[PDB]
């Protein structure tokens, strides 16, 4: 089927010797993958050991999780930008599939924020770096689909790295990705039209960006707090949106609202978003 | 879309007052659901409190997980058999969706087995009770799809209860369920034709039953140990199968093999399986 084809094609510059990789503690688990801290000997021109992160399948992986890991690999090969996690390689030939990437010292953005108390200007800087990465992926004709504080990494120097490319889809031909069956993206980050109509575009990424803004501004808050996901259908189509959080300027809130406009064409594009944020920074 | 329709239809005998339910410790998490121990006051004719288990959505649920929880509910309403977990009710009207079911004192079959050392006759008894439940579901025209030691519960008296109906599908019309996108069932329990062709039938359930037999016989072993899931495509179609485990009679092994025949029509049906196991019991 489509997977056996991919697996067979795959098994036929990115390959890294398994014997040169040493895995250590588990850094995190989750939807399709398990991530461990690791070290790699003689990695792509670097002398000695480099500290890296490695994603692999969890116990009892499904075809869906295998497909997602292969897809993330496929996407990460094609992208290169200061605000996107950097791929080093993979181990495929011996043992389970292992993807080797840049280690982000501070872990997830959500974790980093929740450990915090950081200025409003640090917050705007974070959002803006993410918007630049997103402007780059949108130019590559990729829809990311799973943008969220938990899927952004914070590297040395508090650099934002957009991560978790397992659900990212190429939209070169149509400028949208449409999925017949139900999505595996949390409902509380999905655009109204993704939720109801299974349509994903750069503008649905912009909606998710608005929820990410809310997460940044609340320092890792939980969106629509105390509201069950199943209530989102009706809440959204009756035109409700999250209220301005505490510690949020009105210009920041105004931007969140614009990202959550019902009509996708009415939301800003990532380039507008970046301009808006740089402007808040300098004022 | 199909989900908003279900959620709206749903929100329009099974309903239980949220105020009569008290939730306690987390019993387990996993693919679509979180399960907690709980107590329910005046549950369906029972005076006083009854100890129950409750499944709900995990944090950051996706449309796919919501759909699976609704589907499990829908299936559990229609089934009733001594070897299938019994539904009591749900809380929907206030707060998150909660499904209230029979509490299984010994937890999952896999956990129960791994805590063990139990006779061969206890083992055959377990398999046989599960085969009876499965013979009943097959007669109801349901394909279970996710049969595995982790999805069988052990209740008071060491009674097997088939559980986790989120992926079960009605096959009344065609005797098969076909899924275009990748399955969320672990690859190591899937029939060769489910893995390659996305076709699910009672006979693919029989394959999974063979893997479950292997799990019972090894006391909760890990199938195809040390073999990565992606190697299963080629291993399976080149005709390889797991070797006879230690502490396994040849008749038991012969049954596993028959469940794993390439041609689905060549595997036994659950009624043959039950006859085979009762025969091993009495001999
Ligand atoms: C392909 C791939 C590999 C690793 C990661 C990743 N996840 N995570 C967690 C989720 C533990 C914060 C990480 N933490 C630090 N550094 C990383 N590189 C990661 C993401 C994608
Ligand atoms: C709808 C539904 C509700 C609960 C369970 C369930 N899962 N589990 C675990 C997985 C913790 C062993 C249970 N353990 C004991 N009793 C139970 N009833 C369950 C399964 C399905």
């Amino acid at each position: 089927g489509p997977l056996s084809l991919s697996v067979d094609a795959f098994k036929i510059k990115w390959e890294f010797p398994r014997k040169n990789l040493v895995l250590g503690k588990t850094l995190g688990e989750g939807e399709f993958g398990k991530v461990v801290k690791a070290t790699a000997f003689h990695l792509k021109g670097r002398a000695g050991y480099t500290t890296v992160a490695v994603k692999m399948l969890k116990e009892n992986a499904s075809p869906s999780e295998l497909r997602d890991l292969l897809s993330e690999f496929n996407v990460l090969k094609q992208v290169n930008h200061p605000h996107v996690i950097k791929l080093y390689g993979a181990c495929s030939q011996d043992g389970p599939l292992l993807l080797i990437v840049e280690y982000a010292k501070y872990g997830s953005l959500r974790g980093f924020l929740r450990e915090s108390r950081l200025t409003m200007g640090d917050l705007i800087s974070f959002a803006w770096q993410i918007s630049q990465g997103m402007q780059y992926l949108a130019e590559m004709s990729l829809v990311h689909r799973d943008l969220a504080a938990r899927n952004i990494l914070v590297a040395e120097g508090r650099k934002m790295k957009i991560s978790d490319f397992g659900l990212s889809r190429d939209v070169y031909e149509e400028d949208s990705y449409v999925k017949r069956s139900q999505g595996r993206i949390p409902v509380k980050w999905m655009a109204i039209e993704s939720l109801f109509d299974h349509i994903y575009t750069t503008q649905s990424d912009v909606w998710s960006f608005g929820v990410l803004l809310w997460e940044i501004v609340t320092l890792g808050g939980n969106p629509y707090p105390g509201i069950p996901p199943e209530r989102l259908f009706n809440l959204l189509k009756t035109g409700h949106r999250m209220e301005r959080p505490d510690n949020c300027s009105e210009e920041m809130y105004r931007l969140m609202l614009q990202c959550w406009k019902q009509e996708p064409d009415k939301r800003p594009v990532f380039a507008d978003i970046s301009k808006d944020l740089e402007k808040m920074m300098v004022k």
Side-chain angles (χ1 to χ4, degrees), chain A residues 1-10 14-18 20-28 30 33-45 47-58 60-85 87-93 95-114 116 118-138 140-155 157 159-171 175-230 232-236 238-242 244-249 252-253 255-257 259-260 262 264-265 267-274 276-278 280-282:
Chain A
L3 192 55
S4 50
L5 292 178
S6 289
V7 168
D8 185 43
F10 186 97
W14 297 113
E15 189 66 17
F16 190 70
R18 181 59 186 87
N20 282 6
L21 183 70
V22 179
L23 310 172
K25 68 177 181 189
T26 293
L27 289 173
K34 157 182 165 164
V35 172
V36 298
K37 202 175 175 170
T39 190
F41 187 79
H42 199 218
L43 185 69
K44 279 197 167 313
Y49 288 96
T50 308
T51 297
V52 292
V54 169
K55 188 182 276 191
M56 64 193 73
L57 297 173
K58 300 182 314 261
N60 305 332
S62 68
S64 190
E65 284 156 1
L66 178 54
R67 174 174 179 266
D68 286 353
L69 190 58
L70 287 167
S71 189
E72 167 148 59
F73 192 28
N74 178 67
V75 165
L76 284 171
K77 287 171 191 177
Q78 306 156 38
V79 295
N80 290 100
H81 180 276
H83 294 304
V84 168
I85 209 57
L87 172 73
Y88 296 125
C91 304
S92 121
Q93 294 304 87
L97 184 61
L98 301 186
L99 310 187
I100 306 155
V101 310
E102 185 174 15
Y103 172 65
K105 174 182 190 182
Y106 300 106
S108 81
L109 185 50
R110 186 188 189 253
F112 181 84
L113 291 173
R114 286 172 77 78
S116 287
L118 286 182
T119 63
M120 186 51 67
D122 298 318
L123 302 191
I124 289 149
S125 174
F126 301 168
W128 171 87
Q129 287 172 47
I130 296 156
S131 189
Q132 294 291 279
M134 284 311 289
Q135 179 175 347
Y136 165 82
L137 299 162
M140 297 294 284
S141 301
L142 291 157
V143 64
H144 189 274
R145 292 172 78 222
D146 203 355
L147 194 59
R150 94 198 86 87
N151 304 139
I152 302 302
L153 299 163
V154 185
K159 299 303 164 217
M160 304 303 95
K161 309 286 172 172
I162 293 159
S163 175
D164 295 335
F165 288 86
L167 300 185
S168 312
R169 289 299 177 272
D170 189 66
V171 299
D175 290 341
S176 78
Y177 163 81
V178 174
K179 169 164 192 60
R180 195 195 287 258
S181 78
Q182 300 304 318
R184 280 90 71 10
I185 296 136
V187 336
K188 283 181 176 179
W189 283 253
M190 293 179 70
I192 187 171
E193 81 273 9
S194 306
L195 196 51
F196 280 91
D197 298 336
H198 300 207
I199 295 179
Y200 301 87
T201 58
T202 298
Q203 299 308 101
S204 70
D205 281 350
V206 156
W207 183 295
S208 294
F209 190 86
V211 181
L212 167 56
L213 271 182
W214 190 95
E215 290 182 278
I216 291 165
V217 154
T218 53
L219 289 184
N222 305 309
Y224 308 93
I227 305 188
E230 64 267 30
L232 258 83
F233 293 102
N234 186 71
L235 195 71
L236 262 15
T238 64
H240 301 97
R241 301 292 184 277
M242 286 187 265
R244 186 171 156 202
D246 305 340
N247 305 142
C248 181
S249 70
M252 187 63 84
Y253 188 57
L255 178 55
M256 286 170 199
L257 290 187
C259 295
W260 309 320
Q262 185 178 276
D265 289 333
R267 310 174 195 150
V269 298
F270 279 113
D272 299 335
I273 292 170
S274 299
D276 285 343
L277 290 155
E278 298 154 3
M280 299 177 220
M281 189 73 177
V282 72

Short mmCIF file of all heavy atoms in Angstrom, two decimals, chain A residues 66-112, unseen atoms left out:
data_model
loop_
_atom_site.label_atom_id
_atom_site.label_comp_id
_atom_site.label_asym_id
_atom_site.label_seq_id
_atom_site.Cartn_x
_atom_site.Cartn_y
_atom_site.Cartn_z
N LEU A 66 4.68 5.29 11.87
CA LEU A 66 5.80 5.06 10.96
C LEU A 66 5.76 6.04 9.79
O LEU A 66 6.74 6.70 9.54
CB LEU A 66 5.82 3.62 10.47
CG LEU A 66 6.91 3.20 9.45
CD1 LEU A 66 8.41 3.51 9.88
CD2 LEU A 66 6.74 1.68 9.10
N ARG A 67 4.61 6.15 9.10
CA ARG A 67 4.43 7.13 8.05
C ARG A 67 4.81 8.56 8.48
O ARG A 67 5.51 9.25 7.74
CB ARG A 67 2.97 7.12 7.49
CG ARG A 67 2.67 8.26 6.45
CD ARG A 67 1.28 8.08 5.87
NE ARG A 67 0.95 9.12 4.92
CZ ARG A 67 0.30 10.23 5.22
NH1 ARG A 67 -0.11 10.43 6.47
NH2 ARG A 67 0.06 11.14 4.28
N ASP A 68 4.30 9.01 9.62
CA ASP A 68 4.65 10.33 10.18
C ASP A 68 6.14 10.53 10.42
O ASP A 68 6.67 11.58 10.11
CB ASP A 68 3.92 10.55 11.51
CG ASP A 68 2.43 10.84 11.31
OD1 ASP A 68 1.96 11.00 10.14
OD2 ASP A 68 1.72 10.93 12.33
N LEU A 69 6.82 9.53 10.97
CA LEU A 69 8.29 9.64 11.16
C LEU A 69 9.00 9.75 9.79
O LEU A 69 9.90 10.56 9.64
CB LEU A 69 8.88 8.47 11.99
CG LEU A 69 10.35 8.62 12.44
CD1 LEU A 69 10.54 9.89 13.28
CD2 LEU A 69 10.83 7.37 13.20
N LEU A 70 8.54 8.99 8.79
CA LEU A 70 9.20 9.02 7.45
C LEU A 70 8.98 10.37 6.77
O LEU A 70 9.86 10.92 6.11
CB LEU A 70 8.74 7.89 6.55
CG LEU A 70 9.25 6.47 6.88
CD1 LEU A 70 8.44 5.45 6.10
CD2 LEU A 70 10.73 6.27 6.57
N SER A 71 7.80 10.92 7.02
CA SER A 71 7.37 12.16 6.44
C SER A 71 8.14 13.34 7.04
O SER A 71 8.59 14.24 6.32
CB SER A 71 5.88 12.29 6.71
OG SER A 71 5.41 13.37 5.98
N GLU A 72 8.25 13.35 8.36
CA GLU A 72 9.06 14.35 9.05
C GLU A 72 10.51 14.36 8.49
O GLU A 72 11.04 15.40 8.17
CB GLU A 72 9.06 14.03 10.54
CG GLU A 72 10.08 14.78 11.34
CD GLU A 72 9.60 15.08 12.76
OE1 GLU A 72 9.29 14.12 13.47
OE2 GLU A 72 9.54 16.26 13.16
N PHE A 73 11.12 13.19 8.39
CA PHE A 73 12.42 13.02 7.74
C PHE A 73 12.46 13.65 6.36
O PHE A 73 13.31 14.51 6.10
CB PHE A 73 12.75 11.52 7.65
CG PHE A 73 14.17 11.24 7.26
CD1 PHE A 73 15.20 12.13 7.58
CD2 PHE A 73 14.49 10.07 6.60
CE1 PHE A 73 16.53 11.88 7.22
CE2 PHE A 73 15.83 9.80 6.24
CZ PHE A 73 16.85 10.71 6.55
N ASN A 74 11.54 13.23 5.48
CA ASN A 74 11.41 13.76 4.12
C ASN A 74 11.31 15.30 4.09
O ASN A 74 11.94 15.94 3.26
CB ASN A 74 10.22 13.11 3.41
CG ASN A 74 9.98 13.66 1.99
OD1 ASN A 74 10.81 13.44 1.09
ND2 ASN A 74 8.83 14.34 1.78
N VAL A 75 10.57 15.89 5.02
CA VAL A 75 10.40 17.34 5.04
C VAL A 75 11.66 18.04 5.53
O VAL A 75 12.05 19.07 4.98
CB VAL A 75 9.14 17.81 5.89
CG1 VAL A 75 9.22 19.29 6.17
CG2 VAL A 75 7.85 17.53 5.11
N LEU A 76 12.26 17.48 6.58
CA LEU A 76 13.44 18.09 7.19
C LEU A 76 14.65 18.11 6.26
O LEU A 76 15.42 19.05 6.31
CB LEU A 76 13.80 17.42 8.51
CG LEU A 76 12.94 17.76 9.73
CD1 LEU A 76 13.31 16.86 10.85
CD2 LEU A 76 13.03 19.22 10.18
N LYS A 77 14.81 17.08 5.42
CA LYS A 77 15.79 17.13 4.29
C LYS A 77 15.71 18.37 3.39
O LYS A 77 16.70 18.72 2.81
CB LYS A 77 15.64 15.93 3.37
CG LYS A 77 16.15 14.66 3.94
CD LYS A 77 15.72 13.53 3.00
CE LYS A 77 15.96 12.19 3.65
NZ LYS A 77 15.51 11.05 2.80
N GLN A 78 14.53 18.96 3.21
CA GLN A 78 14.32 20.03 2.23
C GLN A 78 14.35 21.42 2.83
O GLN A 78 14.35 22.40 2.12
CB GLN A 78 12.96 19.90 1.53
CG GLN A 78 12.60 18.57 0.85
CD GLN A 78 11.06 18.41 0.76
OE1 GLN A 78 10.34 19.39 0.51
NE2 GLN A 78 10.55 17.21 1.04
N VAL A 79 14.30 21.52 4.15
CA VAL A 79 14.27 22.82 4.78
C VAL A 79 15.57 23.18 5.49
O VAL A 79 16.29 22.31 5.98
CB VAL A 79 13.03 22.98 5.70
CG1 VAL A 79 11.77 22.95 4.85
CG2 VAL A 79 13.00 21.93 6.83
N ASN A 80 15.85 24.49 5.49
CA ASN A 80 17.07 25.07 6.03
C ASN A 80 16.80 26.53 6.27
O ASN A 80 16.59 27.30 5.34
CB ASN A 80 18.25 24.95 5.05
CG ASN A 80 18.74 23.50 4.90
OD1 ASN A 80 18.40 22.79 3.92
ND2 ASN A 80 19.54 23.05 5.87
N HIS A 81 16.79 26.90 7.53
CA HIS A 81 16.50 28.25 7.94
C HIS A 81 16.88 28.33 9.41
O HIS A 81 16.81 27.31 10.13
CB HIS A 81 15.02 28.57 7.73
CG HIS A 81 14.64 29.95 8.14
ND1 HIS A 81 14.33 30.27 9.45
CD2 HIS A 81 14.52 31.10 7.43
CE1 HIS A 81 14.01 31.56 9.52
NE2 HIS A 81 14.12 32.08 8.31
N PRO A 82 17.35 29.51 9.85
CA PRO A 82 17.82 29.71 11.25
C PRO A 82 16.76 29.41 12.30
O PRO A 82 17.10 29.19 13.47
CB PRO A 82 18.17 31.21 11.30
CG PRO A 82 18.49 31.57 9.82
CD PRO A 82 17.57 30.70 8.99
N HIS A 83 15.48 29.43 11.90
CA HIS A 83 14.38 29.23 12.85
C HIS A 83 13.60 27.94 12.62
O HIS A 83 12.45 27.79 13.05
CB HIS A 83 13.52 30.49 12.93
CG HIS A 83 14.27 31.64 13.52
ND1 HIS A 83 14.86 31.56 14.76
CD2 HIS A 83 14.61 32.85 13.00
CE1 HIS A 83 15.49 32.70 15.01
NE2 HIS A 83 15.36 33.50 13.96
N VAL A 84 14.26 27.01 11.96
CA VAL A 84 13.70 25.67 11.75
C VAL A 84 14.74 24.68 12.28
O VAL A 84 15.93 24.80 11.98
CB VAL A 84 13.43 25.44 10.23
CG1 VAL A 84 13.13 23.94 9.93
CG2 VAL A 84 12.32 26.37 9.71
N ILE A 85 14.30 23.69 13.07
CA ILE A 85 15.22 22.68 13.59
C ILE A 85 16.08 22.02 12.49
O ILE A 85 15.60 21.69 11.42
CB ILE A 85 14.48 21.64 14.53
CG1 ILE A 85 15.43 21.05 15.60
CG2 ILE A 85 13.74 20.55 13.72
CD1 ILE A 85 16.09 22.10 16.49
N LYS A 86 17.37 21.84 12.73
CA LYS A 86 18.26 21.36 11.66
C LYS A 86 18.45 19.86 11.73
O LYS A 86 18.78 19.31 12.80
CB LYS A 86 19.60 22.11 11.70
CG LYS A 86 20.53 21.77 10.57
CD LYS A 86 21.98 22.29 10.85
N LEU A 87 18.19 19.19 10.61
CA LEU A 87 18.45 17.77 10.46
C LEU A 87 19.94 17.48 10.23
O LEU A 87 20.56 18.14 9.40
CB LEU A 87 17.62 17.20 9.30
CG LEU A 87 17.89 15.76 8.86
CD1 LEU A 87 17.35 14.77 9.86
CD2 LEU A 87 17.31 15.45 7.48
N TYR A 88 20.49 16.51 10.96
CA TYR A 88 21.85 15.99 10.71
C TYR A 88 21.90 14.71 9.93
O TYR A 88 22.79 14.55 9.14
CB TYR A 88 22.67 15.79 12.01
CG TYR A 88 22.94 17.05 12.74
CD1 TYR A 88 22.57 17.18 14.06
CD2 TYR A 88 23.52 18.14 12.08
CE1 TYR A 88 22.80 18.36 14.75
CE2 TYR A 88 23.72 19.36 12.76
CZ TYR A 88 23.35 19.45 14.10
OH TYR A 88 23.54 20.63 14.82
N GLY A 89 20.96 13.80 10.15
CA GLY A 89 21.03 12.50 9.53
C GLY A 89 20.00 11.53 10.06
O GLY A 89 19.08 11.92 10.77
N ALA A 90 20.16 10.26 9.71
CA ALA A 90 19.35 9.20 10.23
C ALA A 90 20.14 7.91 10.29
O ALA A 90 21.11 7.73 9.56
CB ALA A 90 18.11 9.01 9.35
N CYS A 91 19.72 7.01 11.17
CA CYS A 91 20.17 5.63 11.14
C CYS A 91 18.99 4.78 10.70
O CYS A 91 17.95 4.73 11.36
CB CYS A 91 20.67 5.17 12.52
SG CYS A 91 21.98 6.20 13.19
N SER A 92 19.14 4.12 9.58
CA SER A 92 18.08 3.30 9.05
C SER A 92 18.51 1.83 8.83
O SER A 92 17.75 0.87 9.07
CB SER A 92 17.60 3.93 7.75
OG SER A 92 17.75 3.05 6.68
N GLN A 93 19.76 1.65 8.41
CA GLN A 93 20.20 0.40 7.86
C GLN A 93 20.26 -0.65 8.94
O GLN A 93 19.85 -1.79 8.73
CB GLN A 93 21.54 0.59 7.12
CG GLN A 93 21.46 1.51 5.84
CD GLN A 93 20.41 1.05 4.78
OE1 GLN A 93 19.22 1.39 4.84
NE2 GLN A 93 20.89 0.27 3.79
N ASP A 94 20.73 -0.25 10.13
CA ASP A 94 20.77 -1.16 11.28
C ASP A 94 19.88 -0.63 12.41
O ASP A 94 20.05 0.55 12.92
CB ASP A 94 22.22 -1.41 11.77
N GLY A 95 18.94 -1.51 12.78
CA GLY A 95 18.01 -1.26 13.85
C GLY A 95 16.84 -0.37 13.49
O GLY A 95 16.54 -0.15 12.31
N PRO A 96 16.15 0.15 14.50
CA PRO A 96 14.97 0.98 14.25
C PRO A 96 15.41 2.29 13.60
O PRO A 96 16.57 2.70 13.76
CB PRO A 96 14.41 1.23 15.67
CG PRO A 96 15.13 0.31 16.60
CD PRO A 96 16.45 0.00 15.94
N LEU A 97 14.50 2.93 12.87
CA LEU A 97 14.73 4.27 12.30
C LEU A 97 14.96 5.30 13.39
O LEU A 97 14.20 5.37 14.37
CB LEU A 97 13.55 4.70 11.43
CG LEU A 97 13.71 6.05 10.69
CD1 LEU A 97 14.89 6.04 9.72
CD2 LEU A 97 12.38 6.47 9.97
N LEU A 98 16.02 6.09 13.22
CA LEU A 98 16.42 7.11 14.18
C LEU A 98 16.69 8.35 13.40
O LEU A 98 17.47 8.28 12.42
CB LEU A 98 17.74 6.72 14.86
CG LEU A 98 17.78 5.41 15.63
CD1 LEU A 98 19.13 5.23 16.39
CD2 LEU A 98 16.60 5.33 16.60
N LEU A 99 16.08 9.46 13.78
CA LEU A 99 16.36 10.73 13.14
C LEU A 99 17.17 11.56 14.07
O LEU A 99 16.77 11.77 15.21
CB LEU A 99 15.09 11.51 12.79
CG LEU A 99 13.95 10.85 12.03
CD1 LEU A 99 12.90 11.95 11.66
CD2 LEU A 99 14.51 10.13 10.75
N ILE A 100 18.25 12.11 13.54
CA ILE A 100 19.25 12.83 14.31
C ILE A 100 19.16 14.32 14.01
O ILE A 100 19.36 14.77 12.88
CB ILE A 100 20.69 12.31 13.99
CG1 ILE A 100 20.77 10.79 14.20
CG2 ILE A 100 21.72 13.03 14.86
CD1 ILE A 100 21.85 10.13 13.37
N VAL A 101 18.83 15.10 15.03
CA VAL A 101 18.69 16.53 14.78
C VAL A 101 19.43 17.32 15.85
O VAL A 101 19.74 16.80 16.91
CB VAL A 101 17.17 17.02 14.67
CG1 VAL A 101 16.35 16.14 13.69
CG2 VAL A 101 16.50 17.05 16.00
N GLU A 102 19.73 18.56 15.49
CA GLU A 102 20.10 19.61 16.40
C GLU A 102 19.44 19.49 17.77
O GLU A 102 18.22 19.42 17.88
CB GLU A 102 19.65 20.92 15.75
CG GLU A 102 20.04 22.19 16.46
CD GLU A 102 19.69 23.47 15.67
OE1 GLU A 102 18.90 23.41 14.69
OE2 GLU A 102 20.18 24.56 16.08
N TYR A 103 20.27 19.53 18.80
CA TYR A 103 19.80 19.56 20.17
C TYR A 103 19.42 20.98 20.62
O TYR A 103 20.23 21.94 20.50
CB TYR A 103 20.88 18.97 21.07
CG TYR A 103 20.59 19.10 22.53
CD1 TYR A 103 19.49 18.43 23.12
CD2 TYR A 103 21.40 19.90 23.33
CE1 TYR A 103 19.23 18.57 24.48
CE2 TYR A 103 21.14 20.04 24.69
CZ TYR A 103 20.08 19.37 25.26
OH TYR A 103 19.87 19.55 26.60
N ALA A 104 18.18 21.13 21.11
CA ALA A 104 17.71 22.42 21.60
C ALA A 104 17.78 22.39 23.11
O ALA A 104 16.97 21.74 23.78
CB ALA A 104 16.33 22.74 21.12
N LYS A 105 18.82 23.05 23.60
CA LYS A 105 19.18 23.16 25.04
C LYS A 105 18.04 23.48 25.99
O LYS A 105 18.04 23.00 27.13
CB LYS A 105 20.26 24.26 25.16
CG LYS A 105 20.71 24.66 26.54
CD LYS A 105 21.73 25.76 26.39
CE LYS A 105 22.44 26.09 27.68
NZ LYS A 105 23.41 27.23 27.43
N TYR A 106 17.08 24.31 25.58
CA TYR A 106 16.03 24.68 26.53
C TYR A 106 14.74 23.91 26.37
O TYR A 106 13.78 24.21 27.08
CB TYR A 106 15.75 26.19 26.51
CG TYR A 106 16.97 27.00 26.87
CD1 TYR A 106 17.65 27.69 25.89
CD2 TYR A 106 17.46 27.04 28.20
CE1 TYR A 106 18.78 28.42 26.19
CE2 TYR A 106 18.61 27.78 28.52
CZ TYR A 106 19.26 28.47 27.49
OH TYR A 106 20.39 29.21 27.72
N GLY A 107 14.71 22.93 25.47
CA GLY A 107 13.54 22.08 25.32
C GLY A 107 12.46 22.83 24.55
O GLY A 107 12.76 23.74 23.78
N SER A 108 11.20 22.47 24.81
CA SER A 108 10.05 23.08 24.14
C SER A 108 9.79 24.49 24.62
O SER A 108 10.07 24.84 25.76
CB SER A 108 8.81 22.20 24.24
OG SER A 108 8.13 22.35 25.48
N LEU A 109 9.27 25.31 23.72
CA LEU A 109 8.84 26.66 24.08
C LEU A 109 7.83 26.66 25.24
O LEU A 109 7.92 27.49 26.16
CB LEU A 109 8.21 27.36 22.86
CG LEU A 109 7.82 28.82 23.05
CD1 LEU A 109 9.01 29.62 23.66
CD2 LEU A 109 7.35 29.43 21.73
N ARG A 110 6.86 25.77 25.19
CA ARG A 110 5.88 25.70 26.26
C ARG A 110 6.56 25.46 27.61
O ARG A 110 6.29 26.18 28.59
CB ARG A 110 4.83 24.61 25.98
CG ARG A 110 3.74 24.61 27.00
CD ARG A 110 2.78 23.40 26.86
NE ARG A 110 1.64 23.62 27.75
CZ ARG A 110 1.41 22.97 28.89
NH1 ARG A 110 2.23 22.00 29.31
NH2 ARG A 110 0.36 23.29 29.62
N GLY A 111 7.42 24.43 27.67
CA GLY A 111 8.19 24.14 28.91
C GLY A 111 9.03 25.34 29.36
O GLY A 111 9.06 25.70 30.53
N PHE A 112 9.73 25.94 28.42
CA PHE A 112 10.55 27.10 28.71
C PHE A 112 9.73 28.27 29.31
O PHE A 112 10.10 28.86 30.32
CB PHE A 112 11.23 27.51 27.41
CG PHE A 112 12.13 28.69 27.55
CD1 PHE A 112 13.46 28.52 27.98
CD2 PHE A 112 11.68 29.97 27.25
CE1 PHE A 112 14.29 29.60 28.10
CE2 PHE A 112 12.51 31.07 27.37
CZ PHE A 112 13.83 30.88 27.78
#
